[PDB]
Symmetry: D2
Amino acid sequence: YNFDFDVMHPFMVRAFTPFFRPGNLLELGSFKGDFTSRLQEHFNDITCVEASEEAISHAQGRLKDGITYIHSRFEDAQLPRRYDNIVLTHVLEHIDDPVALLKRINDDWLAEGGRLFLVCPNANAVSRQIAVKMGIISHNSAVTEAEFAHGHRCTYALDTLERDASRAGLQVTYRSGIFFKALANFQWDQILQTDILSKEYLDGCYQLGQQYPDLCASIFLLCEKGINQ
Amino acid sequence: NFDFDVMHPFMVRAFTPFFRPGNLLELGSFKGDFTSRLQEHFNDITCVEASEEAISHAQGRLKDGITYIHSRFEDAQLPRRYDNIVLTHVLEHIDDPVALLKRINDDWLAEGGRLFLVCPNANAVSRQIAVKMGIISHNSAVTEAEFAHGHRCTYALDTLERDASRAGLQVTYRSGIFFKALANFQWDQILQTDILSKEYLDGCYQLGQQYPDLCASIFLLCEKG
Amino acid sequence: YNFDFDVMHPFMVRAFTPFFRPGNLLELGSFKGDFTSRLQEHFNDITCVEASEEAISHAQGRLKDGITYIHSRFEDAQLPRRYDNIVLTHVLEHIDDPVALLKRINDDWLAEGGRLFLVCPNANAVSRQIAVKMGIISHNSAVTEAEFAHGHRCTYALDTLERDASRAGLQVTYRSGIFFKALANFQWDQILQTDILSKEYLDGCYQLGQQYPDLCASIFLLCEKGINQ
Amino acid sequence: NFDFDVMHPFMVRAFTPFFRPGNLLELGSFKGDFTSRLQEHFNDITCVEASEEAISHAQGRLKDGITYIHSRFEDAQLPRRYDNIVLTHVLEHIDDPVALLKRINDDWLAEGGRLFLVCPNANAVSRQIAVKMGIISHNSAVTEAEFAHGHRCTYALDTLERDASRAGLQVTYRSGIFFKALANFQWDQILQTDILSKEYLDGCYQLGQQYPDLCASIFLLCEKG
Ligand SMILES: [Cl-]
Ligand SMILES: [Cl-]
Ligand code: NA
Ligand code: NA
């Protein structure tokens, strides 16, 4: 059990489902294709952009047909088309110039009526706030040493995430949160090996999280295209 | 009027990303004040309203493309099932709310259809301040004036989802509409002044989504169970 | 490990400590003396009112000197004195007429300058809200069957608790919450047998709970005497 | 003025149940506006203020029982240690806030003494609405105007407790003062009207305690580590 892959990925797909547009999907930062496989249950026409040849090859081997793979960094990517749905989940925090990426999404890649599904780890998640109170993390939006090593350049909260989307020219249509998270991953991974927490308890955390977006594991902005000339 | 001038447009904004293609049923359409806004999104709207006077008034002021059904909910015979059903600021008046919601689930929602269920929120900031002030006993109380207006309940997210769930609906999304720190009587006064802008109101709508429990109205997006 | 006795009792004493007045203390509903023993670290002159002869006898055996024991129901209790500190923790929810008890506290028992420490289980605790979303409990302020069996007649939240204090003539001076609680007791009691959660993590829950009173395990009103004639 | 007329009295209300018997030190007492309120609770108050003009003004308008110390914090030589230390709306101006807090911990607090640390809150409702409106980039930003006024930080509970902790203080209680949904410029306008009562303001103070993160100002009660 990995909390991110086994718990968060499915709830993210749940969170997105009511907002999906008919048509195609673009997955930015598809890596090894773990999230793509869930998206394939919803879309037959998926385009995947990933900078790592190794990751993109693994995906290619594992996933079913109907994926267009684009091996590129986002700033160099030349896409053949515009997209009805764009997924950017746990990628923006790794980008040196996040406004410039969101701006490409707005200006170059969103179809008319298209939607961006923008999801990042939340600074203000309960578990993270507890770690801040414990002094393990200096403050909520801090980037820790491990985090920086893993490539994080920011730790978004709803305030700074909407700022950057807004700065990029996107229209933010909906703000929400995914999964009320009171334990840290290291704790989840241990507890999930036990029968202490049920699947219903997890579903409850998802359900309650919608009522306290600011306290969830990940925060979620639904965005639409704004006119920029 | 805060409710018609501020709340109605934000309710439509909140629904817009969830609307399904197809038709729409408005339950409790009254004089058509909300229907007019919905007409910007749908050419095929069916309206159910028990007051003949109200429904007559709407018919007078709305554009073509409306099927009007003059009936109590318990008596209503609808000719189709619906991709979108709106029940906004109605359920808190209903003596047996779960029974109405169960008709929606079992009879009126199309497969794939969505119910837009919106009710005034007991935990709204302005109401909580009124409770702290001793004006209202507690958040989910029904005041004498509200009871006189026909309220039988003051929903919060907990009680509203309970009733939807008991009816057999699948509650898909929970949210709030408008971060509300002032009472209607105060808004109606301040709205005559230039102390608050439209951008302020927009800001309250945006912030509201981040604190659903504190909003003016709470919103459950539901699907057929 | 019992979450209530091992985790909540000590945090309750922490929560109270900054507000304690010099002088004596009255503990209403002292039962077997589990909480009294912690209070004895702070006060040498404690008066304990308890309706159960069995419980009050157990306390008597176990606790150190400096306790005045009063075996009475609250409505019949004739106390010799007024008190600088009154503790009513997890008792008010068991009372058929809670305003009438709080009114005795205001009118008969609080000394001038005296403080009431009023603590009840919170309807809106995170764990409880999750159980509501799971459909195990109908709504936050519901009283479940097990709860009713244990003697609960109400499940307070900050709104209804301040209402009743106010109705009784008390002045509510401070509102807070004790312990950010995302798991149910049955889960705590299992997890506490493991090394999954540390003492620092628990302290973090206490610390964060103060910032979200409405979501804590127990809610806490600090009250002072109001004039009633 | 919202800050002097509403905020100051609620700050005293918030401190009152935590006050220790003994003496009190007010750091950054300026013209004595807050000191006058504290004088209702303490006969032995020591005031530290760097502006000679300000401190002269206070001396003119305050009652006996005040020791005035005209000094920068870094230079201040205090004759005693203090049972109560007040540092309200000062720390956000200090270039090295942890260094000031460390002097408080190590040199000025009496054993058993309490520090009343209060700063304007980045996550205040009114500020969050301003951020959603695009007026301020984000909650903890410092605006040009605020920077011109000397702010170097916009604290929230997370950053304020971080700095107190780094100084070696023991953070004993965390709270908020005043649930604030309107900006000062809006309060100052609405306060001229009769749209909001004193009971409304009291209600905002009461509700604020239940949502510290959303208050006008945040309040840490600290003790010596
Ligand atoms: Cl159907
Ligand atoms: Cl000392
Ligand atoms: Na442009
Ligand atoms: Na009386």
